[PDB]
């Protein structure tokens, strides 16, 4: 018997089984409703310091593989699930879940009532928690640790996940037939986009490349001056974990761009930053948006998009500066999902766009880029 | 799981192919594949209690039969898949013959090994931890009973003892991201229960028929729905119990509370335990609920309408003849033969032509 | 591996039990169990090249026959085990029926898998790295050949091409802790060769007859020994090739150099290759070496004594009849029928009683 | 394809497959002829800094188990074998050999011509070497390390395997039936024996207790003074790695005791020390003795013993002090194996004793400890 334990700030306990590394894990507890895509979720920087509970019971059915990695590493602090399948069964699998978790040193637990956990987070909002896996997991220790956890509110996580040096990215989307393509060459891409790495996902980058963009990935703190120096065709503000607010660095920089005529496009954290720099205010969500079936309305078009959400904070619509037009809202909860500057080539989206490869956001960005080079 | 009726079709090719031959279907919900599958099995109304064996372990011919059943599927395949594991066949083995994904096979295989332990340890080895692990894998009391060599009630007793009972989760469309005001539930072995039964009213429970089959059609479902609409309108809290995905009775709108469950004693008793209803109708879902009538009554269930015993009075050919007699009515000449020559003799009495009922 | 003769025994219970029924035995030496085992298989003189199949993949009854053979061992169980794996039985399944330790069964299973890859890739999939791996698992040229659908010779050529040959280790009682002056060797596919043939003398190779069987006894072994002792005395460097553990022939004293190996074209050629003997006597070991005569010669082996063709002259019922004819001697009336009706006729000619030789 | 490689000082290469930890290992390369007892060999301190090659092709047939560790840990530098079995198949097995190797982090290679290795070591003598298990093992690098290796000649290994602080040992020998017996009670043991942990094997200890010996396990350095300070019934000097010569610290000590009337018993390393302390000289063997089929004669009784041997150095018979009687000799090479002080209650044995439930030796010992208390 390989025991594991998960304990919530509030004292709630969940007894189960260890499936990952031995040890303990602490962080903010969230639930994600995605029925598929666990790997991508685990490896999404957007989950740093978070303990991920998946609502879908069998997690690990298709094992894992490199192509499904959203970053160079597992960002989830822990994984909490109802059942770990006996086998991974899929032509793409290269290593079962459990072995993967272990290789990445992730503390994971299985066999607990995820539904009860979900309903609790839903009802009472997120909570910090600690999972302990090993011989005789100490529930008090667990509880201590959970209670001691500082918490994501006011925590700058982007500086934690961002890259240390800047670098190129010219690799596009994966395909069934040929997997991940070779990285394109620079003369093979018309556009040059500077993308701020606030804990960016591989798939977004891949998308942009799909659209003609050579990317220069820059650290989160990178100055505006430093960047402008690069004569960027467009500026992209990635997705990323934690609170946007304490990102003094970014906001500053962004404001600069906003003086300029350079197209600016933001996703998730970027979107929050853009909003902050535009004078808007951000809030931290009861439990957030973590799933892949979230309905969002494009108000302009009056169409609904089924989206992927991975956020715990959000831009308050009520404090929206008037140079900020609302472009999209959540059909689940009425929260802000899109915005555009009425006075600048800058817009952003709360959810996480994906490749087909209708790409209206992306295409817009590209559109703005062109107009900009047309000038 | 589809429901077949090949037994009623003499000369019919009974192998499964692109042209449907099933007459109905049963559905089940569980927190895990294993649990879900086994619950469906016991709710199939074919006499199964899970993976009950089709061929004997000593039949030197088994492997052959098994192979065949796997390679060219019939209505019985799922049971032969387990017997294959029991017989020594490998998951790859089984796969190559069936093309059924290993993901599913490994799970069936695991249930089998578990049944083996059960078998090995007997009831005595059925401690609370193990038993809970079994229940969580969807094992029926009945199936366990069989493996341990005891009556079904014995297993159930043991659970009572250990306070080992299921919880009820709700269907919500959203993995619990939003709350529900609807009471569309399924049982499982977990921590938190969402049944939250009302103490408020007088409840009426209606038992459906499970999957449809020939002679056990929509006609019964119709009746079951009607009982609910009527009694609800009249102000009762109506509870429906059924597991046929095709019917109106399994429509959440049809009743106050819906338990999408196997229409078995075990499952029905659990709900009753918690609902503590005022009455239970067993007369409208066909043979399925009918057959449960005595055990339910005996187990304390407030069965309403025509009593189990009265139903048995009518159903039982002997008990019955006696009524007919009693009332001095006209029944056709009958006899209960055991041996051939016996029947030839009695036949003579009765008079041809004859109706020979097993 | 024991050697049986049940075919000579009509009516005889052929299951193995506590009472011995074998007539001889063969021994093999390998650097690994698989190597060792497969070598023994190909030296058993029963027409096996390794785990040759006993039942067809497509036989519907194959699982059953396989089960019986497994549960109640016969001389052929070793083959049925491979067959079991082919058919999809699991290692645990085979274990249950045979009680053979899994450490062994797993190795057979691996062998079977590799076989299957061969079958799959064909002669073309036989790259140097893979061939080498197979040869180290004890795979015989002949066996791979059937799997790949080619002539054993093709495989042989293939290895030539790849400079893929075995090395020779020596027996020494002490795991190489001390040096040996004796030349008691066995083949393996490894790095270092310990053969160190002499360039010195004239070498004479004597081929033994493998395990003893009825009609192929010690009498031939007696001869083989004599050949050695004799020539050795005469001053030739004698080299014995045999793998029967019971005999004087396999005693390191009996000869200058002993190669404890399977008496097969394959194994012999490898020795010849490095020994380059003056001659090779194939007439003293009975049937085994005899049947290799042609092929050895054809491969350039220096066969001394009565020629392989000559032998062929006398063995060949027709070749012979002609010479008997030639010599003007007395042979019994004979005929070569194909058809029954054809026989009864010829029969009348020849005249009963009759000796019918298949 | 998990490559590995072994290279000898001499440049000899051995290509194979990785079956242990990833990485490199270096030390003296030795060969062991034991067809059984691999776990026991791996966990024997006598192997520190030594890379172990096993003559017996299939290593790992019975997996592993704690009852089979001769010490707290695996001391062997690396493991070299011909074949790692597909499964372990024994009722006592708790963990396959490969998994065992990893957890203990041992670099190890399977599938090489261990015979080839053996003969070379036998012919030319022991050799330092390097194993490199990884993605693309570097031959030159491995050679580079191999050559660089300092070597065991003149190396004190005892001080590296000894214990920090002293301790009590009251555990007896294993039985099939009971297994590892509970640890006797101090008051349950007649005698008190002090044992210098020169990297001592568990079983030997077990064999003493078996004999009624309470035990005090001390560190290598340990002063005679401090020792004598515990009024020990007899002193025992354990087996251990490296060269005995450089262990000034004990020769000294020993010599103390050697003026005393306390009985002193030495095994392997401790048999060497005794020797030194008594004036004899020690040499380093061409290839040493490693395996379990070694014939040794009890000259006194003219009988032969089949022993277990784990040594690289010996005691030179030619340089013996009169007060040193030769009690045993190797029937394999006529080397020294046992000695007894003419003038003192001291004697030692080169080979390694084992329980049936050496008995002679062991019994003698006690019979000495006895005659000593009788006084
Ligand atoms: Cl739980
Ligand atoms: Cl790139
Ligand atoms: Cl148990
Ligand atoms: Cl017989
Ligand atoms: Cl290959
Ligand atoms: Cl090698
Ligand atoms: K649990
Ligand atoms: K009826």
Coordinates of N, CA and C in Angstrom, one line a residue, chain B residues 26-31 35-36 39-40 42-45 166-169 171 184-189 205-211 239-245 249-250 257-272 288 292:
Chain B
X26 N -29.9 -1.5 -22.0 CA -29.9 -1.1 -20.6 C -28.7 -0.1 -20.5
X27 N -28.8 0.8 -19.6 CA -27.8 1.8 -19.3 C -27.4 1.8 -17.9
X28 N -26.2 2.1 -17.6 CA -25.8 2.3 -16.3 C -24.8 3.4 -16.1
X29 N -24.8 4.0 -15.0 CA -23.8 5.1 -14.6 C -23.0 4.6 -13.4
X30 N -21.7 4.9 -13.5 CA -20.8 4.6 -12.4 C -19.7 5.6 -12.4
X31 N -19.0 5.7 -11.3 CA -17.9 6.6 -11.2 C -16.7 6.1 -11.9
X35 N -17.2 -0.1 -12.5 CA -18.4 0.0 -11.7 C -19.6 0.1 -12.7
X36 N -19.4 1.0 -13.7 CA -20.4 1.2 -14.7 C -20.8 -0.1 -15.4
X39 N -22.5 -2.7 -13.2 CA -23.9 -2.3 -12.9 C -24.8 -2.6 -14.0
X40 N -24.3 -2.3 -15.2 CA -25.1 -2.5 -16.4 C -25.4 -4.0 -16.5
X42 N -25.7 -6.4 -14.2 CA -26.7 -6.9 -13.3 C -28.0 -6.2 -13.6
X43 N -28.0 -5.2 -14.4 CA -29.3 -4.6 -14.7 C -29.9 -5.1 -16.0
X44 N -29.2 -5.9 -16.7 CA -29.6 -6.4 -18.0 C -30.8 -7.4 -18.0
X45 N -31.2 -7.8 -16.8 CA -32.4 -8.7 -16.9 C -32.2 -10.0 -17.6
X166 N -23.8 2.6 -0.6 CA -23.5 3.5 -1.6 C -23.9 4.9 -1.3
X167 N -23.4 5.9 -2.1 CA -23.8 7.3 -2.0 C -24.5 7.5 -3.4
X168 N -25.2 8.6 -3.5 CA -25.8 8.9 -4.7 C -25.3 10.2 -5.3
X169 N -24.8 10.2 -6.5 CA -24.3 11.5 -7.1 C -25.4 11.9 -8.0
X171 N -26.7 13.7 -11.9 CA -26.3 14.1 -13.2 C -26.5 15.6 -13.3
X184 N -31.7 13.6 -10.4 CA -31.4 12.6 -11.4 C -30.1 12.0 -10.8
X185 N -30.3 10.9 -10.2 CA -29.2 10.3 -9.5 C -28.9 8.8 -9.9
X186 N -27.6 8.4 -9.5 CA -27.0 7.0 -9.6 C -26.2 6.8 -8.4
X187 N -26.1 5.5 -8.1 CA -25.4 5.0 -6.9 C -24.0 4.7 -7.3
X188 N -23.1 4.8 -6.3 CA -21.7 4.5 -6.4 C -21.2 4.4 -5.0
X189 N -20.0 3.9 -4.8 CA -19.3 3.7 -3.6 C -18.3 4.8 -3.4
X205 N -42.8 5.2 -4.8 CA -41.7 4.7 -5.7 C -42.3 3.7 -6.7
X206 N -41.9 3.9 -7.9 CA -42.4 3.2 -9.0 C -41.2 2.4 -9.6
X207 N -41.3 1.1 -9.8 CA -40.3 0.3 -10.3 C -40.5 0.0 -11.8
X208 N -39.6 0.4 -12.6 CA -39.6 0.1 -14.1 C -39.2 -1.3 -14.4
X209 N -39.1 -1.5 -15.7 CA -38.7 -2.9 -16.1 C -37.3 -3.2 -16.6
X210 N -36.5 -2.2 -16.6 CA -35.2 -2.5 -17.2 C -35.2 -2.4 -18.7
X211 N -34.3 -3.0 -19.4 CA -34.3 -2.9 -20.8 C -35.5 -3.7 -21.3
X239 N -41.0 8.9 -7.2 CA -39.7 8.4 -7.3 C -39.8 7.2 -8.4
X240 N -39.0 7.4 -9.4 CA -38.9 6.4 -10.4 C -37.6 5.7 -10.4
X241 N -37.7 4.3 -10.6 CA -36.5 3.5 -10.6 C -36.4 2.7 -11.9
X242 N -35.4 3.0 -12.7 CA -35.3 2.3 -13.9 C -34.0 2.6 -14.6
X243 N -33.7 1.8 -15.7 CA -32.4 2.0 -16.3 C -32.4 1.8 -17.8
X244 N -33.6 1.9 -18.4 CA -33.8 1.9 -19.8 C -33.6 3.3 -20.4
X245 N -32.5 3.5 -21.1 CA -32.2 4.8 -21.7 C -33.2 5.3 -22.8
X249 N -40.0 7.1 -19.0 CA -39.9 6.9 -17.5 C -38.5 7.4 -17.1
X250 N -37.5 7.4 -18.0 CA -36.2 7.7 -17.5 C -35.8 9.2 -17.9
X257 N -38.1 12.5 -8.4 CA -36.7 12.0 -8.2 C -36.5 10.8 -9.1
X258 N -35.4 10.8 -9.8 CA -35.1 9.7 -10.7 C -33.8 9.0 -10.3
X259 N -33.9 7.7 -10.0 CA -32.8 6.8 -9.7 C -32.5 5.9 -10.9
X260 N -31.5 6.3 -11.7 CA -31.2 5.6 -12.9 C -30.3 4.4 -12.5
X261 N -31.0 3.4 -12.0 CA -30.4 2.2 -11.4 C -30.9 0.8 -11.9
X262 N -30.1 -0.2 -11.6 CA -30.5 -1.5 -11.9 C -31.7 -1.8 -11.1
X263 N -32.7 -2.4 -11.7 CA -33.9 -2.8 -11.0 C -33.8 -4.1 -10.4
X264 N -33.0 -4.1 -9.4 CA -32.7 -5.3 -8.6 C -33.0 -5.1 -7.2
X265 N -33.0 -6.2 -6.4 CA -33.3 -6.1 -5.0 C -32.3 -5.2 -4.3
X266 N -31.0 -5.6 -4.5 CA -29.9 -4.8 -3.9 C -30.1 -3.3 -4.2
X267 N -30.2 -2.9 -5.4 CA -30.3 -1.5 -5.7 C -31.6 -0.9 -5.2
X268 N -32.7 -1.6 -5.3 CA -33.9 -1.1 -4.8 C -33.9 -0.8 -3.3
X269 N -33.4 -1.8 -2.6 CA -33.3 -1.8 -1.1 C -32.5 -0.6 -0.6
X270 N -31.4 -0.3 -1.3 CA -30.6 0.9 -0.9 C -31.3 2.2 -1.0
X271 N -32.1 2.3 -2.0 CA -32.9 3.5 -2.2 C -33.9 3.6 -1.2
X272 N -34.6 2.5 -0.9 CA -35.6 2.5 0.1 C -35.1 2.8 1.5
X288 N -39.9 -8.0 -14.4 CA -38.7 -7.6 -13.6 C -39.0 -7.2 -12.2
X292 N -39.4 -9.2 -8.0 CA -38.8 -8.7 -6.8 C -39.7 -8.6 -5.6

